[PDB]
Design a protein around this ligand. Structure first.
Ligand code: HEM
Ligand code: CAM
Ligand code: K
Length: 405
């Protein structure tokens, strides 16, 4: 369904891409988005889908817009417009300058020092899940590892019970890839309904878990409000339950289909962190954006105050103007250019946690289960939205080829 083209938008820039159901999805989601980078497509296009909005299709523009918070505000960062208007997570819904005091606080809960401290438990969980899978010779990777490994770590960090995962995972998914049963506003309202009593309890009686730290925290030296703490804890929940979970499935799908790549990593384990970075480029998965604060001419195009612009973080590293042969995975790639974790003042705060989870997964899996493949006949389906993912990933292996550590 197509919104009527606004008078200010030139007809020759129309390209009706649907970020929640892209045409070429059956080829793979990164592939489907990469159609925006085919020869005759301009650097900045307008789609009439999802209410109508701009899309920057090249890393140069994506980077520029993410740096210019004066013209490109994060106040309304999701498409469609009702989702972006409801969106109020902190720090993402704020621009500098007042954004920055809240980042600092979020860094006490997910920053490098905290990840270094979680390192042992992250390792232990990865090993326990993989060892229990190893003799079975099969798994449903999405449900049996990609979801439990990073989600159980987040719930440990937040001091939330694991049996709450199904509900919270359902809500987080309606915000990024809605099935249509809930609007963004309704899912948000439900996540905040979950958090409100836990935030009150933990202000009254502080523990050492992430929610306690945020809810009793200070920002530029003044106490955080209950409403602020809720808006920050909601975003940490979303990052914990719907980023790495999806990324692991893209990576393992790739490794299942590419023995020569696993072989490289089995033979040279020291290459694993570099391989992590190249898979973060090739299987980049996030796309949000910004709202115009004023009329503004950008790259020869007249943008109007209030227009939304999708700035897909996924696309910068896929752009052949940033990386030659961008669809090829090369663990030896000399200059891995990407914006997978965003760009500008909102650069991902969870990226150190995410890289630790990914590198630990690769090392631990490859040590125990070096040889695996996709279940025969399985037609692996991706799904697209603010964060893209893999619907199911059935894997099989011969337990005879595995290795107990
Ligand atoms: C592969 C995994 C991850 C990817 C690709 C990813 C990607 C991103 C991107 C693109 C942004 C910027 C969004 C924008 O500019 O509007 C962002 C921000 C952020 N991320 Fe991540 N993320 C991942 C993991 C995580 C994790 C595991 C957490 C926390 C548990 C997290 C917490 C956050 C927070 C709090 C922000 C907001 C920073 C701010 O607005 O200043 N992320 N991430
Ligand atoms: C776009 C994101 C990946 C980033 C962290 C969670 C997420 C869905 C956001 O709302 C900000
Ligand atoms: K908003």
């Amino acid at each position: 369904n197509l919104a009527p083209l606004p008078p200010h938008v030139p007809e020759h820039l129309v390209f009706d891409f649907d970020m929640y159901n892209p045409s070429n999805l059956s080829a793979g989601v990164q592939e489907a988005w990469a159609v925006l980078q085919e020869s005759n497509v301009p650097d900045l296009v307008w789609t009439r889908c999802n209410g109508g909005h701009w899309i920057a299709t090249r890393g140069q523009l994506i980077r520029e817009a993410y740096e210019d918070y004066r013209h490109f505000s994060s106040e309304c960062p999701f498409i469609p417009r009702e989702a972006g208007e409801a969106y109020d997570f902190i720090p993402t819904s704020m621009d500098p300058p007042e954004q920055r005091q809240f980042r600092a606080l979020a860094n006490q809960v997910v920053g490098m020092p905290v990840v270094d401290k979680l390192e042992n438990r992250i390792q232990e969980l990865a090993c326990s899940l993989i060892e229990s899978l190893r003799p079975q010779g099969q798994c449903n990777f999405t449900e049996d590892y990609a979801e439990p490994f990073p989600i159980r770590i987040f719930m440990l960090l937040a001091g939330l019970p694991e049996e709450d995962i199904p509900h919270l995972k359902y809500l987080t998914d309606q915000m990024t890839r809605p099935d249509g049963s809930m609007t963004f506003a309704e899912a948000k309202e439900a996540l905040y309904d979950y958090l409100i009593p836990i935030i009150e309890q933990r202000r009254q009686k502080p523990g050492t878990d992430a929610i306690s730290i945020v809810a009793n925290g200070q920002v530029n030296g003044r106490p955080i409000t209950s409403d602020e703490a809720k808006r920050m804890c909601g975003l940490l929940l979303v990052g914990g339950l719907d980023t790495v979970v999806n990324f692991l499935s893209f990576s393992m799908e790739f490794l299942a289909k590419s023995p020569e790549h696993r072989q490289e990593l089995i033979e040279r384990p020291e290459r694993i962190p570099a391989a992590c970075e190249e898979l973060l480029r090739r299987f980049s998965l996030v796309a949000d954006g910004r709202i115009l604060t004023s009329d503004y001419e950008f790259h020869g195009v007249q943008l109007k105050k209030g227009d939304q612009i999708l700035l897909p973080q996924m696309l910068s590293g896929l752009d052949e103007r940033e990386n030659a042969c961008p669809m090829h995975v090369d663990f030896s790639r000399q200059k891995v250019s990407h914006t997978t974790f965003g760009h500008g003042s909102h650069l991902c705060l969870g990226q150190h946690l995410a890289r630790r989870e990914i590198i630990v997964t690769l090392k631990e899996w490859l040590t125990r289960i070096p040889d695996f493949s996709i279940a025969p006949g399985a037609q692996i389906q991706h799904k697209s939205g603010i964060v893209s993912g893999v619907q199911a990933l059935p894997l099989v292996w011969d337990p005879a080829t595995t290795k107990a550590v």
